[PDB]
Design a binder for this molecule. Structure first.
Ligand SMILES: *C/C=C1/C(=C/C2=NC(=C\c3[nH]c(/C=C4/NC(=O)C(C=C)=C4C)c(C)c3CCC(=O)O)/C(CCC(=O)O)=C2C)NC(=O)[C@H]1C
Ligand SMILES: *C/C=C1/C(=C/C2=NC(=C\c3[nH]c(/C=C4/NC(=O)C(C=C)=C4C)c(C)c3CCC(=O)O)/C(CCC(=O)O)=C2C)NC(=O)[C@H]1C
Ligand SMILES: [Cl-]
Ligand SMILES: [Cl-]
Lengths: 489, 492
C-alpha cells in the first residue's frame, strides 16, 4: 500500500502488473518453460487456459521459439522485433533476459527513415540553447503529443523545464522547477537504464502478472520490461494534470542522467514499436550532439577567461600600484563567470559592483573564508548555512565564491549570486489550479513548484565545476601579478 | 602537357580526361536531360549500340532508370547498389552533380550483404578499444581480415605534413614499412584536397589501360572528376606503385576536426577492387573509426593534463614545508621529466647546471640560456630545431635537437629545460635495409627507400615537435613554480 509516507521507497521495478497495450510471458533462462504470464495473454494471443507449466514451444510454436532464441543472442538492451508472425497474425515483440528470467512482450503490429529525418533537423544546431529549443518543437510535431518538455536535472536532483512545445490551450511549465523527491531514486535508476519509458493510459486498468510471487517467493523483476505498470502515486499526479499518457526519452551525458525529453498527451496514446525505435535512435543522437555542444561551450568559456586574465596580466606589468589597478578593474572580473555581484576586499576597504552584501557584512564573510579556506578558492550557494546573519541579505546575495589575493593577508575578490528564486523566468499561470485525488494537493505541479522553492530558500545557483576552474585560473593569474610586481618592485 | 618530377607538385589530377576500367561513366547536363560525355567502354559495359553524346538519358538508360536516378539526386555522391537496367541486368551506380554536370558511374553488380551489417561487425570489433594504441593496432588486422588486401597500413600525418606508418598488417612474405616516414611532397596538395573531399580512393589496377572520357574537352572545358570514384590515377603514383610491386589500393580518409588526420591505406600486389556495398561498409567503418579515435584522443589528453596538475599540486604542498627552494629543485628537477615526453631535463640556476638523461654538455648551457633570455617574453619558449636558432647546437644534435625552456624568474635567466633527441635517433623502423626497388623512367625518387632517405634529410638535426598538450603542461609548470616562489616570499 504505497502512500506519500513510503512512495520514496516504492518497489516500482516489481509492481506485479503490466499496462494493457501489450501482454507478457516470463520463461526460464533457456526459454524452455512458461513460468508466468499477464492475465491478458489469452485474449491478445488467442491462447486458452493457464499458460504456466506449458513449454515455450507449445505456447509460441516451433518457428517463433526458434526465431526468439536466435534474437536472444543479440542480447546490451532488449531486442526489438517488429512485425513477427505468430496463426499468421503480426506482433511487435520485445525480448530480454534479466534475473535468470526471459521476458517476452507482445503488441498487435501496425525506423531509420523517421530517425534520419528528425536527426537532420537538429544536427546543424550550434548552441545547447538552439538544440533544446528546436527539439521540443520537432518531437511534438513528429510524435504527435499535446506537450513535449525537456527537463535538465540540477546538482540537487531537482528538474528545470528548459524547453516546451504545447497546444495553445494548455498552461505553460517553461522555467518551472520540481523537487528531487518528485522522481524517487528507483525511478531515476530506471530512467538511466531504459532509453524510453511508455505510459499508454494513466487511467488504464493494470493487468496482473500470474503469479505475482512465484512458488520460491520471488517477485518478477520488470526493470527492462516496457509494459511494466506505473506507480499509483504517479498515475494520480498525471490524472490531476489532465495527462492520460506519456513517453520519456532519457538524455545521458558523461554516463549520467542529464534530463528527460518528456512527451505528455491529454488522451491515451502509445507509439508503435517502429516509431519508438526511431525515437530511441533520435535520443542517442540528441544526447551525443548535446554532449558535443556542451564541451564546446565549456572550452569557449574557459578560453574567454584565459584571454581576459592574460590581458589583465599584460596590463598589470605597466602599473606600479596593483591595489589601485584592482580598485579600477575588479568589476570587469564579473564577466569571467555568471554572477549577480562582484567585490574587492583589500586592506579592510570594500568596493562593490551589482548585487552584493552591504559593506557592514563583508568583515564577517572575509573572517569566515580565512577560517574555512586552505588558501584556495572557497565557494558556497547557501551563505546562511555558513553564517546565519547572512539570511538578512539573502535576497541580494545567497551565494559567494571567494578568491584569495594572499596567504598572509585576508584580502579577497568576492563573487555573489542572488537567491535562485529572484532569477526565476517562469512562463506559467499562477491562477491555474488543479483537482486532486485521495493523496491531496502534493501531486500537483503547483505544490511541486512551492516545495522546490522551500528546498532552495536562502540558496543561490550552485558554483559549477567550470565556474571553479575559471576562479582557480583567476587566483593563479593574480598570484602571478603580485609575484612579477615584487620581482620588479 | 606531360607530368614529371619538376611539375607533379601541380599536376591537375582532378581533370585527367580518363577513368579506370572497372566501371564506365556517363556525364549529363545538370537536369539529366542529355548525355554530354561518356567513357569509351560504356558501349561494351552497358551494351549500348552507337555514339551516346547528343542522345537523351531516357533514350540511353530507359525512362524508369532516369526517373529513379533523378529521385536519388533529389534525396557525398549517391551510392545505389543493384539498380536494374533496361536489359534486366543489375548495376551498382554512383551519382553526383558538380560544376553544372551530372556524373553517373556504373559497375556490374555482384552478390553482397547489406552494407550496414558488414559495417556493424567491423565497428563491434573496435568499439571496445580503450586506448588510441589499441584502436590503431587492431584496425589494420581487422580491415585486412575483412577486405582481403595483401597489406593494410595506417599513416598519421605529422605537423610538417609527413606521413608516419603507425600500424601495419601484411602478408608474411612482404617487407615491413612499420615505423617508416615519407615526406609531405610524396602526397601533393591537390591529392590531399581530394583525400579530404572523398572518404574512399580506389585504384583497381596501377598498370591498367586508361579509358578516355569522350570528349576530353567539350566550350574548351575539361570534365571535373573530383568526386568520380572511377577517376584515373597520376602516372607518377602508378609508377611509384609499380616500383613497390603494388597493383591496386583503397584508402579510407581519417578526418579529425575537419582536417586529414591520416589514411587507412589498403595495398594489393595484384589487380583488386571491392564491390560498392563493401565500399559503403568501409566508408561507415571509416566514419566510426574517426569518431572513436577523437574520443580516445580526448580522454588521453585529459588524463595527461590531469596527471600534470596532480603532480604539480603535490610539488606545491611539498615546497610549502621547504625553507630552501633552490635545494628542493636541485633534488626534485628529474621528476619533472614525467610531465611530458622528453629524452632529458635539466636545471639552470645561478649559472650552475644539473642534468638528467640526454642533455647538451654542461659547457653548452650558458649559450642556450642566453639565447632563451633574448628570445622569450618571460613565457615558455620551445623549438624542435636548436641548430636553426644556434648553429653551435649541431655538434650535440644527436643527444639534444629540441629544447622547451620554462623560465623560473623575470629578473634572473634561470630555467627548467626539457630536451628531445634528434628524431632519427628515436626511430623504431621494422623495415629491411637490404630491400631494394626496381624503377621506371622517373628513376629511384618513386621508391619507399628514397622517400625515407628524403624524409630523413627534411628532419636532420630536428626533434619531435612540442605538441599543444606539451606547451599547456609547460605553462602549468611555469605557473605552479611562480606560485612556489611567491608563497616562499610571502612566508620568508
Ligand atoms: C513519493 C513519490 C512521488 C512520485 C513518484 C514518481 N514520479 C515519477 C515520474 C515523474 N514525476 C514527475 C513530476 C512532475 N512534477 C511537476 O512539477 C511536473 C509537471 C509540471 C511533473 C510531471 C515527473 C516530472 C516525472 C517524470 C516523468 C514525466 O515527466 O512524464 C515516477 C515514475 C513513473 C513511471 O514509472 O514512469 C514515480 C514513481 N512523484 C511524486 O510527486 C512523488 C511524491
Ligand atoms: C610530385 C608528385 C608525387 C607523388 C604524387 C602522388 N602520390 C599519391 C599517393 C601516395 N603517394 C604515397 C607515397 C608513399 N611513400 C612511401 O614511402 C610509401 C610506402 C612506403 C608510399 C605508398 C602515398 C603513401 C600515397 C597515398 C596513397 C596510398 O598510400 O595508397 C597521389 C595520389 C594518387 C591517387 O590519385 O589516388 C599522388 C598524385 N608521389 C610522389 O612520390 C611524388 C614525387
Ligand atoms: Cl510549436
Ligand atoms: Cl548543460
Amino acid at each position: 500500500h504505497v502512500d506519500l509516507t513510503n512512495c520514496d521507497r516504492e518497489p516500482i521495478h516489481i509492481p506485479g502488473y503490466i499496462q494493457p497495450h501489450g501482454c507478457l510471458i516470463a520463461c526460464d533462462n533457456a526459454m524452455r518453460m512458461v513460468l508466468r504470464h499477464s492475465e491478458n495473454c489469452g485474449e491478445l494471443l488467442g491462447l486458452e487456459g493457464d499458460l504456466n507449466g506449458r513449454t515455450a514451444e507449445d505456447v509460441l510454436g516451433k518457428k517463433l521459439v526458434h526465431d526468439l532464441r536466435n534474437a536472444l543472442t543479440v542480447t546490451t538492451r532488449p531486442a526489438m522485433l517488429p512485425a513477427m508472425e505468430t496463426d499468421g497474425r503480426s506482433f511487435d515483440i520485445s525480448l530480454h533476459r534479466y534475473k535468470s528470467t526471459t521476458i517476452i512482450e507482445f503488441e498487435p503490429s501496425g525506423p531509420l527513415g523517421t530517425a534520419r529525418k528528425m536527426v537532420d533537423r537538429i544536427r546543424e544546431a550550434d548552441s545547447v540553447e538552439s538544440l533544446i529549443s528546436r527539439t521540443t518543437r520537432l518531437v511534438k510535431a513528429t510524435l504527435g503529443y499535446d506537450r513535449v518538455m525537456i527537463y535538465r536535472f540540477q546538482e540537487d536532483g531537482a528538474g528545470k523545464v528548459v524547453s516546451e512545445a504545447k497546444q495553445p490551450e494548455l498552461e505553460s511549465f517553461l522555467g518551472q522547477y520540481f523537487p528531487a523527491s518528485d522522481i524517487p531514486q528507483q525511478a531515476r535508476a530506471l530512467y538511466l537504464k531504459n532509453t524510453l519509458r511508455i505510459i499508454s493510459d494513466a487511467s488504464g486498468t493494470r493487468i496482473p502478472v500470474l503469479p505475482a510471487v512465484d512458488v520460491s517467493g520471488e517477485p518478477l523483476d520488470l526493470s527492462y520490461a516496457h509494459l511494466r505498470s506505473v506507480s499509483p502515486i504517479h498515475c494520480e499526479y498525471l490524472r490531476n494534470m489532465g495527462v492520460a499518457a506519456s513517453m520519456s526519452i532519457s538524455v545521458i551525458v558523461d554516463g549520467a542522467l542529464w534530463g528527460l525529453i518528456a512527451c505528455h498527451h491529454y488522451s491515451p496514446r502509445v507509439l508503435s514499436m517502429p516509431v519508438r525505435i526511431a525515437a530511441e535512435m533520435f535520443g542517442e543522437f540528441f544526447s551525443m550532439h548535446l554532449q558535443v555542444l556542451k564541451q564546446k561551450r565549456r572550452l569557449d568559456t574557459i578560453n574567454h577567461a584565459h584571454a581576459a586574465l592574460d590581458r589583465f596580466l599584460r596590463l598589470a606589468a605597466h602599473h606600479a600600484n596593483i591595489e589601485e589597478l584592482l580598485v579600477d578593474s575588479f568589476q570587469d572580473f564579473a564577466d569571467l563567470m555568471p554572477c549577480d555581484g562582484v567585490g574587492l576586499w583589500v586592506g579592510n576597504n570594500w568596493h562593490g559592483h551589482g548585487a552584493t552584501p552591504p559593506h557592514d557584512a563583508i568583515p564577517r564573510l572575509a573572517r569566515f573564508v580565512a577560517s574555512a579556506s586552505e588558501g584556495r578558492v572557497w565557494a558556497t550557494h547557501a551563505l546562511s548555512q555558513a553564517i546565519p546573519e547572512a539570511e538578512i541579505y539573502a535576497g541580494t546575495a545567497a551565494g559567494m565564491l571567494a578568491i584569495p589575493l594572499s596567504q598572509v593577508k585576508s584580502d579577497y575578490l568576492l563573487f555573489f549570486r542572488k537567491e535562485i528564486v529572484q532569477n526565476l523566468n517562469w512562463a506559467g499561470n499562477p491562477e491555474k489550479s488543479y483537482e486532486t485525488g485521495p493523496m491531496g494537493d502534493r501531486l500537483t505541479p503547483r505544490k511541486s513548484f512551492a516545495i522546490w522553492k522551500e528546498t532552495v530558500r536562502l540558496q543561490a545557483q550552485p558554483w559549477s565545476e567550470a565556474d571553479r576552474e575559471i576562479a582557480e585560473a583567476a587566483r593563479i593569474a593574480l598570484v602571478e601579478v603580485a609575484f612579477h610586481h615584487s620581482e620588479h618592485h
